[PDB]
Design a protein around this ligand. Structure first.
Ligand SMILES: [Zn+2]
Length: 487
């Protein structure tokens, strides 16, 4: 068994509680105009907005082992890792609308602000002896010329490993952004070190890191072999002044976190590091730079739009340029795309089985599907009843409203945007496609205390079949065929 090709995960969890105080983006505080997922839900509560208590809710699973290609797939399904825990919000029920965003130098429109940050950076690290090139095609070539020649500033990629020096910088940065507690060594280790990736992706080789540390001099068409997690340490005269935590993916680079020395506030290291990482993505010849989640009404997350790009529509599993939809998500709405030329949807969009083209006209179909008189809930309730014959232990969500009006952690709601709809899970069973799990999916069976390959899925116990089906809802059938699920 080739553990380098496996996604080893624990059973999924759905965790929900009051957004005041669980949500650190909004603290549970919204105007009525930003409170609900769609106009139809706003209308449902018109004049009664005060009776809803906003919840913050996530779904996900802990990973023991994941490779970079698989984490790339997870990012492009809307997940992010928090240490080893792969999670996403419930976009229908969450207080805040979180969208996965990605960009690149093509989408980037260098603003006066951003140009100033690089101009000041060049000055801080460059000697007057520095002799500029006669011309530069682009800011990237300029950066790649002067930065490696600096004698006072050096950046170094290395394995994503704990050191006391990195931890002390983290506590100083966190105190400064007002996390004066909840910063133990163990919390820093879990969050930014001790990753779930393969040994080769963590440690690499001396030559692989050397190659990555000369990325400034890569020529068009060359690549780097690095995949997996990394730390980029910034040194000013040998002192650690910033730390970027980055995941290298086949499709690009994901920013996990960035910390810097509060004494260096005048260096605008948040903007400079983002630009350096956009240059890096371009130089290593990969297509995307992933800044995590975008929230339109949160300043601490909507700054990511300064770097341009596109937003994931998790219901269609396709990205739409942010410029095309910003106007209709600026009141915290859920967007579900539907091309203007296609019939009104009597159902959640099919994810396992045509595909939306955002370059043709489209509307937001959110209320047709997920609104108070949308079809999703009734389709899901019927599907729960159909899944009983297969030994799937789901329960119908019979409440009129998706919102809490004035807890089993293994129970996922019937309807969650971007999870495989229950109606489609039914189709997988009826067509025989669930039997494709046989000889593929593996369990770490905690009662036996051993790995075993599933050989007859439909004969497994209901508790096991229900867990496997929820993993399929989260990551899809094909990805579950390479999973090891701990049960
Ligand atoms: Zn919130």
């Amino acid at each position: 068994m080739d553990f380098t090709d496996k996604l080893i995960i624990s059973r999924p969890l759905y965790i929900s509680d009051n957004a005041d105080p669980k949500c650190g983006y909004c603290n549970g505080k919204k105007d009525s105009s930003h409170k609900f997922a769609s106009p139809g839900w706003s209308d449902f509560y018109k004049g009664d907005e005060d009776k809803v208590e906003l919840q913050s809710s996530t779904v996900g699973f802990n990973s023991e082992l994941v490779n970079a290609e698989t984490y790339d797939k997870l990012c492009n399904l809307g997940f992010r890792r928090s240490g080893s825990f792969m999670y996403k919000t419930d976009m229908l029920r969450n207080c805040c609308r979180l969208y996965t965003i990605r960009t690149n130098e093509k989408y980037l429109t260098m603003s006066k602000e951003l140009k100033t940050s690089l101009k000041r950076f060049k000055k801080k690290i460059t000697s007057p002896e520095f002799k500029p090139q006669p011309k530069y095609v682009s800011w990237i070539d300029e950066l790649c010329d002067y930065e490696p020649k600096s004698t006072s500033f050096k950046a170094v990629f290395e394995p994503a490993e704990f050191t006391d020096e990195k931890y002390d910088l983290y506590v100083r940065y966190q105190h400064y952004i007002h996390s004066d507690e909840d910063n133990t060594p163990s919390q820093f280790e879990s969050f930014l070190c001790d990753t779930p990736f393969t040994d080769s992706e963590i440690t690499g080789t001396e030559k692989e890191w050397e190659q990555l540390n000369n990325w400034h001099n890569l020529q068009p068409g060359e690549r780097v072999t690095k995949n997996g997690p990394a730390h980029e340490c910034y040194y000013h005269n040998g002192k650690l002044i910033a730390l970027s935590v980055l995941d290298f993916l086949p499709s690009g680079v994901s920013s996990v976190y960035f910390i810097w020395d509060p004494d260096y506030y005048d260096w605008s290291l948040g903007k400079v590091s983002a630009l350096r990482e956009l240059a890096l993505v371009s130089k290593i010849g990969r297509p995307y730079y992933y800044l995590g989640y975008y929230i339109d009404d949160c300043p601490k997350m909507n700054y990511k739009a300064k770097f341009g790009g596109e937003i994931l529509d998790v219901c269609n599993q396709k990205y739409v340029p942010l410029s095309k939809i910003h106007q209709i998500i600026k009141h915290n709405e859920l967007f579900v795309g539907l091309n203007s030329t296609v019939a009104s949807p009597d159902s959640e969009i099919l994810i396992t089985s045509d595909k939306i083209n955002f370059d043709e006209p489209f509307i937001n179909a959110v209320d047709d599907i997920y609104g108070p008189n949308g079809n999703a809930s009734q389709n899901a309730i019927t599907s729960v009843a159909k899944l009983r014959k297969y030994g799937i232990n789901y329960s119908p969500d019979l409440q009129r409203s998706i919102y809490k009006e004035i807890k089993d952690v293994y129970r996922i709601p019937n309807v969650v945007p971007g999870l495989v709809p229950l109606m489609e899970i039914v189709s997988l069973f009826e067509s025989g496609k669930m039997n494709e799990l046989n000889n593929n999916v593996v369990l770490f069976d905690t009662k036996i205390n051993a790995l075993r390959i599933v050989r007859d899925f439909i004969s497994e116990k209901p508790e096991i079949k229900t867990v496997i089906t929820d993993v399929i809802r989260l990551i899809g059938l094909d990805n579950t065929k390479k999973a090891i699920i701990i049960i």
